[PDB]
């Protein structure tokens, strides 16, 4: 029987009990020498930092109130000085242990463990910043010189990302993700689907993914920690030079075998961990904190306040054309503006830069292209409107010739013939969200698509979302659209969120579902283009629609779907003309 | 492996009711069976979840064949279970047409669902196709089914007040009961409550009073339509449709030997009436008689409290279990439900203090509920 | 049919004619119903509508295009323009100020800082004109720009000669008001955080230069500003006097010679309101406590590897050694006839050659 919590001796009468209170600073020391004890010389170096590390351990531990911090943080400290201090040949810099330190004790908020660490260290003051997203980016991505060795000894834990609002994938997915997107694990919300089913296959999933060594970003952990946690542990038993940890369904025990590039993110809220976690959790997965504070840099904080009170300036329109009294809010004007939408806009912005450093070339272009990001989802009555707002006639002139010049939005294939022809460079899928007012498409007007796609794309195939109650139907019909032939396929899923139906949950679900069958499906000659078209209405929901979700999905407002073959696709000439010059003939 | 291929080749799911003494857990429902020499293996749930375990987190062969058998396993076996749940929510909300239901699922190619029911009146279904949308189709239609039937007993309720008196289960046993010639003393005696020293010569007094003869007429018209009726429809869904709006508007053709839901509360209404004297009880001084009277008291005082309540009328006989609920942890939704249907339904003759003891002692789920 | 019939822009004053026109029919009419009141509005909306109509009709271009270094008007003769037809007098419960303003911002804003703060020192946006309200339009749009440069990293002024004294004043008040470090908006209370604002941001030595040179900039800049400005020539007197004694806090010790450069040069115009050799001292001792704290945290270190075996009463040295260094330079004694006992009594000069 082991146990991380107490027990009472009516039990342990029958047998023999072993209880262990914690360590002392000596038993630290001497647990540092057994693990730094594989190499002689590093350690007749390192051993120096051995006792303040530990009294400042027991500072860390005597500080705090909940038991945040255990032992697996300390001995994953001296692992991680102890691989610098064998890769390095020459001793630590301060960088090394600040880098160390920070990577290991983070996520704790009423905690400055660099200082507590660099109090009793007083040479390793670094007065240059740290940011936590290289922190992140060196604990996913190792190179050549690191896990190159007999075994792996120095291999960091996992991550555990806690967030606010769940913003974790979105920053993950545009900064982090680089080369091969991972396999996202998630607690799917189709309707009557079994939970145990589900568990089953994303442990499979899982274990696929140790086998052929590709990341995993898990978004439940709650269900699967009765299934993961010796994989959690990071014990291995090595057959041939290979590592095997072990994995359980039930009572079904099993040793799996992981490759030796294998990443596990469990994406969880703040307050989750700190209030559900049962903290042999938060000791084994190397915490670290990632809201949107901590990605954006001052000066893209004040891109965003400058944004939001360009779009609210944008929304606000002062005039008298008919006498009502109806002021708009941007969520009227930009479907999907939730007052959180323009951090996601200038992170999204700057992602698509690529060179960043604030050089005033840069940041007006960052400020142009959150400007264009937002444009490319309004309404086209909201940039009519636009010539009586608040910021100008020429600013709303530069905004019309850049809606309907530059940024397509007649209509749904329109889109399509200059979203095809873009000549997308490293990107071997794009992929793009649409928000409509129109109605959604039929099935004649899916032929027409193909017909008026004859040269270009390979027949659109087009789901319905509500047609879906399990998961495995929508995987069929994805599959079966993957294993037709021909390149550039478009793929068309489709919700409307004005019905009866329960299909406004279900979206995350099937792009999540879409996401990992392209990434374990697709080959590297054919292109993919999922649209994902959304109904909304006037009548209230298009202003309610949480909107701007980053990571792999650009967010446009097509008015509506069907080419007119009546009126003209261009707003300018009806506004030149009056409807008596409308009617002159030739 | 080759056992899941087994499975995938010869193996037959199947729904029963089972005829034992033991409960209708999900665990003793579902049987999956394999024939061969000529000899037979059963397995339960449980060993089929387990070696679905084994399989789900088995070594990846890398070919098509093998994840192509264990994910129509999987999905089989996911949808199969699913048709479990939906008829394990038929059974306990109580509905005596799939209370003696049977399904045979074949895992063949192209082996189809033989259905069978416990009537003498309906034949043998069986359909062949795509086991898949066979089970997916079934499921959603008897989800639809559920929710006829919680709308038709719910409408049955509303417009019989003393069939609110009891639960699902007991509502099926007393319509088992009436119809015998001697119906069992347990029921004789939870008759009491209503009536009050019953008997049967009230009782066969209440079922030969209750049904006319013209129901006779309309369930002939409909066992002579419904051969050229089912005929009407090429696949199993239509045949099933139609049985299952007319066993919603005709409960009484399909089963020709139990009372439905409206002779039922005819005949407890009919047996109301024989035995008069009702209680009319007032209200104390200082609670309003058209509103909810909540009253917070203390542990201790709260059962004296409602002893005082019921003293504004001696000489009218004591409470039972309607218009007095003790709640506690673990009350089940359907307690409170009943309590509150007798308190807001018409057909009632008397006035009647409706108490709610120990309320905040429920849940959160069934106090959001009630 | 007036507006629709220019299209040179030197022409400006002929639909200034037929504006102050409906100006003039407007201020003579009397008040009577509400029949009146939403014709007048009617017909100045009309107005505005062709104006503005007219003014995107001839101005499809940018302002201030500069192609020679010499930031000047592709229309040379625009604020000449925005002046008449903004001056002219309408009602003003009604817009054609709060709307034409806004153009103007809206038009202004479509450009760069830079380019624009490079023109509005470039003598063609003169006659600052006693309230004319388009100039305080481009002052409010220019402390705009000023805000929208320091929140990016880059120096405003290094190429501005803006003779006009009003204007130059006006721009440092707003790079003050608006570079000065906030932390969730203006305190700072301290003398550690502005004394880096000072050292760090470049904008801050030409600042002190240009406002030295002259006291004819101190004069107008604000209420606000010449209390942000004694704050910190407060707090750079303190600091920096406090150079000639060993008083200073050694974290400032290690931010000046971190930024030796730009406190020479704040320091070299300090002196018109020695420094070599007192920075080579400070310098020197400077590099000596830290080399003589090298040795002690080494002799620590080596008496903590036999930690187990035999331990050691460090002095008093165990406790001065925890403290930090944010401790005043006079308690380390670099004293003559030399040695410079510290506060880490190391007890004899044996051991300082034995570390």
Not at chain 1, 59 to 84: H, P, W
Not at chain 1, 281 to 300: A, C, G
Not at chain 3, 268 to 281: A, F, G, P, Q, T
């Given at each position: 029987?082991?146990?991380?919590?107490?027990?009472?001796?009516?039990?342990?009468?029958?047998?023999?009990?072993?209880?262990?209170?914690?360590?002392?600073?000596?038993?630290?020391?001497?647990?540092?020498?057994?693990?730094?004890?594989?190499?002689?010389?590093?350690?007749?170096?390192?051993?120096?930092?051995?006792?303040?590390?530990?009294?400042?351990?027991?500072?860390?531990?005597?500080?705090?109130?909940?038991?945040?911090?255990?032992?697996?943080?300390?001995?994953?400290?001296?692992?991680?000085?102890?691989?610098?201090?064998?890769?390095?040949?020459?001793?630590?810099?301060?960088?090394?242990?600040?880098?160390?330190?920070?990577?290991?004790?983070?996520?704790?908020?009423?905690?400055?463990?660099?200082?507590?660490?660099?109090?009793?260290?007083?040479?390793?003051?670094?007065?240059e910043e740290v940011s936590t997203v290289e922190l992140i980016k060196q604990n996913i991505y190792p190179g050549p010189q690191a896990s190159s060795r007999g075994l792996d000894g120095a291999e960091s834990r996992y991550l555990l990302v806690l967030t606010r609002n769940y913003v974790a994938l979105q920053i993950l997915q545009q900064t982090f993700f680089e080369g091969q997107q991972p396999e996202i694990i998630f607690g799917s919300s189709f309707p009557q689907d079994q939970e145990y089913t589900q568990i089953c296959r994303n442990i499979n999933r899982v274990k696929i993914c140790m086998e052929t060594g590709k990341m995993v970003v898990l978004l439940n952990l709650q269900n699967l920690?009765?299934?993961?946690?010796?994989?959690?542990?990071?014990?291995?038993?090595?057959?041939?030079?290979?590592?095997?940890?072990?994995?359980?369904?039930?009572?079904?025990?099993?040793?799996?075998?992981?490759?030796?590039?294998?990443?596990?993110?469990?994406?969880?809220?703040?307050?989750?961990?700190?209030?559900?976690?049962?903290?042999?959790?938060?000791?084994?997965?190397?915490?670290?904190?990632?809201?949107?504070?901590?990605?954006?840099?001052?000066?893209?904080?004040?891109?965003?306040?400058?944004?939001?009170?360009?779009?609210?300036?944008?929304?606000?329109?002062?005039?008298?054309?008919?006498?009502?009294?109806?002021?708009?809010?941007?969520?009227?004007?930009?479907?999907?503006?939730?007052?959180?939408?323009?951090?996601?806009?200038?992170?999204?912005?700057?992602?698509?830069?690529?060179?960043?450093?604030?050089?005033?070339?840069?940041?007006?272009?960052?400020?142009?292209?959150?400007?264009?990001?937002?444009?490319?989802?309004?309404?086209?009555?909201?940039?009519?409107?636009?010539?009586?707002?608040?910021?100008?006639?020429?600013?709303?002139?530069?905004?019309?010739?850049?809606?309907?010049?530059?940024?397509?939005?007649?209509?749904?294939?329109?889109?399509?013939?200059?979203?095809?022809?873009?000549?997308?460079?490293?990107?071997?899928?794009?992929?793009?969200?649409?928000?409509?007012?129109?109605?959604?498409?039929?099935?004649?007007?899916?032929?027409?698509?193909?017909?008026?796609?004859?040269?270009?794309?390979?027949?659109?195939?087009?789901?319905?979302?509500?047609?879906?109650?399990?998961?495995?139907?929508?995987?069929?019909?994805?599959?079966?659209?993957?294993?037709?032939?021909?390149?550039?396929?478009?793929?068309?899923?489709?919700?409307?969120?004005?019905?009866?139906?329960?299909?406004?949950?279900?979206?995350?679900?099937?792009?999540?579902?879409?996401?990992?069958?392209?990434?374990?499906?697709?080959?590297?000659?054919?292109?993919?283009?999922?649209?994902?078209?959304?109904?909304?209405?006037?009548?209230?929901?298009?202003?309610?629609?949480?909107?701007?979700?980053?990571?792999?999905?650009?967010?446009?407002?097509?008015?509506?779907?069907?080419?007119?073959?009546?009126?003209?696709?261009?707003?300018?000439?009806?506004?030149?003309?009056?409807?008596?010059?409308?009617?002159?003939?030739? | 492996?080759?056992?899941?291929?087994?499975?995938?080749?010869?193996?037959?799911?199947?729904?029963?009711?089972?005829?034992?003494?033991?409960?209708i857990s999900p665990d003793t429902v579902l049987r999956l069976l394999l024939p061969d020499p000529e000899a037979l293996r059963t397995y339960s749930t449980e060993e089929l979840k387990e070696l679905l375990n084994k399989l789900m987190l088995m070594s990846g062969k890398k070919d098509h064949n093998s994840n192509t058998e264990v994910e129509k396993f999987s999905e089989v076996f996911?949808?199969?279970?699913?048709?479990?749940?939906?008829?394990?929510?038929?059974?306990?909300?109580?509905?005596?047409?799939?209370?003696?239901?049977?399904?045979?699922?074949?895992?063949?190619?192209?082996?189809?669902?033989?259905?069978?029911?416990?009537?003498?009146?309906?034949?043998?279904?069986?359909?062949?196709?795509?086991?898949?949308?066979?089970?997916?189709?079934?499921?959603?239609?008897?989800?639809?089914?559920?929710?006829?039937?919680?709308?038709?007993?719910?409408?049955?309720?509303?417009?019989?007040?003393?069939?609110?008196?009891?639960?699902?289960?007991?509502?099926?046993?007393?319509?088992?009961?009436?119809?015998?010639?001697?119906?069992?003393?347990?029921?004789?005696?939870?008759?009491?409550?209503?009536?009050?020293?019953?008997?049967?010569?009230?009782?066969?007094?209440?079922?030969?009073?209750?049904?006319?003869?013209?129901?006779?007429?309309?369930?002939?018209?409909?066992?002579?339509?419904?051969?050229?009726?089912?005929?009407?429809?090429?696949?199993?869904?239509?045949?099933?449709?139609?049985?299952?709006?007319?066993?919603?508007?005709?409960?009484?053709?399909?089963?020709?030997?139990?009372?439905?839901?409206?002779?039922?509360?005819?005949?407890?209404?009919?047996?109301?009436?024989?035995?008069?004297?009702?209680?009319?009880?007032?209200?104390?001084?200082?609670?309003?008689?058209?509103?909810?009277?909540?009253?917070?008291?203390?542990?201790?005082?709260?059962?004296?409290?409602?002893?005082?309540?019921?003293?504004?009328?001696?000489?009218?006989?004591?409470?039972?279990?309607?218009?007095?609920?003790?709640?506690?942890?673990?009350?089940?939704?359907?307690?409170?439900?009943?309590?509150?249907?007798?308190?807001?339904?018409?057909?009632?003759?008397?006035?009647?203090?409706?108490?709610?003891?120990?309320?905040?002692?429920?849940?959160?789920?069934?106090?959001?509920?009630? | 049919?007036?507006?629709?019939?220019?299209?040179?822009?030197?022409?400006?004053?002929?639909?200034?004619?037929?504006?102050?026109?409906?100006?003039?029919?407007?201020?003579?009419?009397?008040?009577?119903?509400?029949?009146?009141?939403?014709?007048?509005?009617?017909?100045?909306?009309?107005?505005?509508?062709?104006?503005?109509?007219?003014?995107?009709?001839?101005?499809?271009?940018?302002?201030?295009?500069?192609?020679?270094?010499?930031?000047?008007?592709?229309?040379?003769?625009?604020?000449?323009?925005?002046?008449?037809?903004?001056?002219?007098?309408?009602?003003?419960?009604?817009?054609?100020?709060?709307?034409?303003?806004?153009?103007?911002?809206?038009?202004?804003?479509?450009?760069?800082?830079?380019?624009?703060?490079?023109?509005?020192?470039?003598?063609?946006?003169?006659?600052?004109?006693?309230?004319?309200?388009?100039?305080?339009?481009?002052?409010?749009?220019?402390?705009?720009?000023?805000?929208?440069?320091?929140?990016?990293?880059?120096?405003?002024?290094?190429?501005?000669?803006?003779?006009?004294?009003?204007?130059?004043?006006?721009?440092?008040?707003?790079?003050?008001?608006?570079?000065?470090?906030?932390?969730?908006?203006?305190?700072?209370?301290?003398?550690?955080?502005?004394?880096?604002?000072?050292?760090?941001?470049?904008?801050?030595?030409?600042?002190?230069?240009?406002?030295?040179?002259?006291?004819?900039?101190?004069?107008?800049?604000?209420?606000?500003?010449?209390?942000?400005?004694?704050?910190?020539?407060?707090?750079?007197?303190?600091?920096?006097?406090?150079?000639?004694?060993?008083?200073?806090?050694?974290?400032?010790?290690?931010?000046?010679?971190?930024?030796?450069?730009?406190?020479?040069?704040?320091?070299?115009?300090?002196?018109?309101?020695?420094?070599?050799?007192?920075?080579?001292?400070?310098?020197?001792?400077?590099?000596?406590?830290?080399?003589?704290?090298?040795?002690?945290?080494?002799?620590?270190?080596?008496?903590?590897?036999?930690?187990?075996?035999?331990?050691?009463?460090?002095?008093?040295?165990?406790?001065?050694?925890?403290?930090?260094?944010?401790?005043?330079?006079?308690?380390?004694?670099?004293?003559?006839?030399?040695?410079?006992?510290?506060?880490?009594?190391?007890?004899?000069?044996?051991?300082?050659?034995?570390?």
């Amino acid at each position: 029987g082991i146990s991380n919590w107490a027990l009472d001796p009516a039990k342990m009468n029958r047998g023999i009990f072993v209880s262990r209170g914690s360590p002392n600073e000596k038993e630290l020391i001497e647990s540092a020498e057994g693990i730094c004890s594989s190499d002689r010389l590093v350690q007749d170096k390192i051993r120096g930092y051995f006792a303040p590390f530990a009294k400042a351990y027991e500072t860390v531990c005597q500080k705090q109130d909940k038991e945040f911090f255990g032992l697996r943080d300390y001995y994953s400290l001296i692992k991680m000085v102890f691989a610098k201090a064998k890769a390095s040949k020459r001793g630590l810099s301060p960088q090394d242990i600040t880098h160390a330190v920070l990577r290991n004790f983070s996520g704790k908020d009423n905690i400055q463990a660099l200082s507590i660490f660099t109090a009793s260290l007083p040479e390793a003051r670094y007065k240059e910043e740290v940011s936590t997203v290289e922190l992140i980016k060196q604990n996913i991505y190792p190179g050549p010189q690191a896990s190159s060795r007999g075994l792996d000894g120095a291999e960091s834990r996992y991550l555990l990302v806690l967030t606010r609002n769940y913003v974790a994938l979105q920053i993950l997915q545009q900064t982090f993700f680089e080369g091969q997107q991972p396999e996202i694990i998630f607690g799917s919300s189709f309707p009557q689907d079994q939970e145990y089913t589900q568990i089953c296959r994303n442990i499979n999933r899982v274990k696929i993914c140790m086998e052929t060594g590709k990341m995993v970003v898990l978004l439940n952990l709650q269900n699967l920690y009765e299934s993961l946690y010796d994989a959690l542990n990071q014990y291995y038993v090595y057959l041939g030079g290979q590592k095997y940890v072990d994995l359980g369904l039930g009572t079904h025990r099993v040793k799996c075998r992981v490759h030796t590039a294998f990443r596990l993110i469990v994406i969880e809220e703040k307050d989750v961990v700190y209030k559900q976690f049962p903290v042999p959790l938060i000791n084994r997965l190397e915490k670290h904190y990632l809201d949107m504070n901590t990605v954006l840099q001052p000066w893209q904080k004040s891109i965003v306040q400058e944004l939001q009170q360009w779009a609210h300036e944008f929304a606000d329109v002062k005039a008298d054309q008919f006498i009502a009294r109806h002021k708009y809010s941007p969520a009227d004007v930009f479907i999907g503006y939730h007052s959180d939408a323009c951090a996601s806009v200038v992170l999204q912005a700057v992602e698509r830069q690529g060179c960043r450093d604030l050089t005033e070339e840069l940041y007006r272009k960052v400020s142009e292209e959150a400007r264009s990001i937002l444009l490319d989802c309004a309404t086209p009555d909201a940039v009519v409107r636009l010539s009586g707002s608040s910021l100008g006639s020429f600013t709303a002139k530069q905004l019309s010739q850049e809606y309907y010049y530059a940024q397509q939005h007649n209509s749904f294939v329109d889109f399509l013939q200059a979203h095809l022809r873009m000549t997308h460079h490293e990107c071997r899928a794009v992929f793009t969200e649409i928000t409509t007012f129109s109605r959604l498409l039929t099935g004649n007007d899916c032929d027409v698509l193909a017909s008026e796609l004859r040269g270009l794309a390979s027949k659109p195939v087009v789901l319905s979302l509500q047609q879906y109650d399990t998961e495995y139907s929508f995987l069929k019909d994805v599959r079966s659209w993957l294993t037709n032939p021909g390149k550039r396929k478009v793929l068309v899923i489709q919700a409307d969120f004005d019905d009866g139906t329960r299909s406004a949950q279900l979206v995350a679900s099937a792009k999540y579902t879409a996401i990992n069958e392209i990434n374990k499906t697709q080959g590297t000659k054919d292109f993919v283009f999922v649209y994902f078209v959304t109904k909304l209405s006037r009548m209230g929901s298009g202003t309610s629609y949480v909107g701007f979700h980053g990571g792999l999905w650009r967010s446009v407002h097509i008015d509506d779907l069907r080419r007119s073959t009546i009126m003209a696709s261009d707003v300018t000439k009806l506004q030149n003309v009056t409807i008596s010059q409308l009617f002159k003939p030739e | 492996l080759s056992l899941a291929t087994a499975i995938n080749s010869r193996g037959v799911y199947v729904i029963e009711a089972p005829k034992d003494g033991q409960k209708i857990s999900p665990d003793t429902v579902l049987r999956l069976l394999l024939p061969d020499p000529e000899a037979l293996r059963t397995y339960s749930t449980e060993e089929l979840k387990e070696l679905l375990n084994k399989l789900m987190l088995m070594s990846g062969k890398k070919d098509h064949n093998s994840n192509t058998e264990v994910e129509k396993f999987s999905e089989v076996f996911s949808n199969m279970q699913r048709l479990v749940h939906v008829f394990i929510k038929l059974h306990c909300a109580g509905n005596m047409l799939f209370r003696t239901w049977t399904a045979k699922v074949y895992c063949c190619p192209d082996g189809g669902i033989f259905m069978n029911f416990g009537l003498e009146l309906l034949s043998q279904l069986t359909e062949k196709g795509d086991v898949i949308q066979l089970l997916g189709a079934l499921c959603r239609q008897m989800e639809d089914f559920l929710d006829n039937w919680k709308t038709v007993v719910a409408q049955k309720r509303a417009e019989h007040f003393y069939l609110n008196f009891y639960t699902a289960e007991q509502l099926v046993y007393l319509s088992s009961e009436l119809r015998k010639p001697r119906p069992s003393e347990a029921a004789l005696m939870m008759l009491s409550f209503i009536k009050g020293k019953c008997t049967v010569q009230d009782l066969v007094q209440a079922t030969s009073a209750c049904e006319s003869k013209a129901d006779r007429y309309c369930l002939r018209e409909v066992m002579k339509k419904l051969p050229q009726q089912l005929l009407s429809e090429p696949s199993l869904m239509g045949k099933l449709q139609v049985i299952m709006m007319q066993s919603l508007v005709y409960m009484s053709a399909f089963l020709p030997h139990c009372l439905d839901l409206d002779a039922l509360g005819r005949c407890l209404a009919h047996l109301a009436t024989m035995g008069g004297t009702p209680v009319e009880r007032p209200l104390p001084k200082g609670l309003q008689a058209g509103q909810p009277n909540l009253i917070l008291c203390g542990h201790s005082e709260v059962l004296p409290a409602a002893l005082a309540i019921y003293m504004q009328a001696p000489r009218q006989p004591l409470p039972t279990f309607d218009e007095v609920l003790l709640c506690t942890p673990a009350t089940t939704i359907e307690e409170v439900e009943l309590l509150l249907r007798r308190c807001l339904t018409s057909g009632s003759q008397g006035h009647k203090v409706y108490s709610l003891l120990f309320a905040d002692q429920l849940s959160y789920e069934v106090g959001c509920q009630a | 049919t007036v507006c629709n019939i220019t299209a040179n822009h030197q022409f400006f004053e002929i639909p200034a004619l037929s504006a102050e026109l409906i100006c003039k029919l407007l201020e003579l009419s009397p008040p009577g119903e509400k029949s009146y009141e939403d014709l007048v509005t009617s017909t100045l909306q009309e107005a505005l509508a062709t104006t503005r109509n007219w003014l995107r009709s001839l101005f499809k271009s940018r302002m201030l295009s500069i192609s020679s270094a010499y930031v000047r008007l592709t229309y040379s003769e625009e604020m000449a323009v925005w002046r008449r037809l903004v001056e002219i007098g309408f009602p003003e419960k009604h817009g054609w100020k709060g709307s034409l303003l806004g153009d103007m911002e809206g038009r202004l804003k479509q450009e760069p800082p830079r380019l624009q703060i490079s023109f509005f020192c470039s003598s063609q946006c003169r006659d600052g004109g006693l309230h004319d309200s388009v100039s305080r339009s481009f002052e409010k749009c220019v402390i705009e720009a000023v805000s929208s440069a320091c929140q990016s990293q880059t120096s405003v002024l290094e190429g501005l000669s803006c003779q006009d004294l009003q204007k130059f004043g006006t721009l440092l008040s707003a790079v003050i008001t608006k570079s000065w470090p906030v932390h969730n908006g203006e305190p700072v209370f301290d003398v550690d955080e502005i004394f880096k604002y000072l050292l760090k941001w470049p904008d801050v030595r030409q600042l002190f230069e240009l406002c030295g040179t002259n006291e004819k900039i101190i004069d107008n800049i604000t209420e606000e500003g010449r209390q942000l400005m004694a704050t910190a020539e407060s707090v750079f007197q303190k600091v920096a006097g406090e150079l000639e004694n060993g008083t200073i806090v050694v974290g400032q010790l290690e931010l000046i010679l971190e930024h030796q450069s730009q406190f020479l040069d704040i320091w070299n115009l300090n002196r018109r309101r020695d420094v070599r050799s007192l920075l080579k001292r400070r310098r020197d001792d400077l590099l000596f406590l830290k080399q003589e704290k090298r040795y002690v945290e080494s002799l620590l270190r080596q008496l903590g590897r036999v930690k187990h075996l035999v331990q050691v009463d460090f002095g008093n040295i165990e406790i001065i050694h925890s403290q930090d260094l944010s401790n005043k330079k006079l308690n380390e004694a670099v004293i003559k006839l030399s040695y410079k006992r510290e506060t880490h009594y190391c007890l004899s000069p044996d051991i300082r050659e034995m570390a």
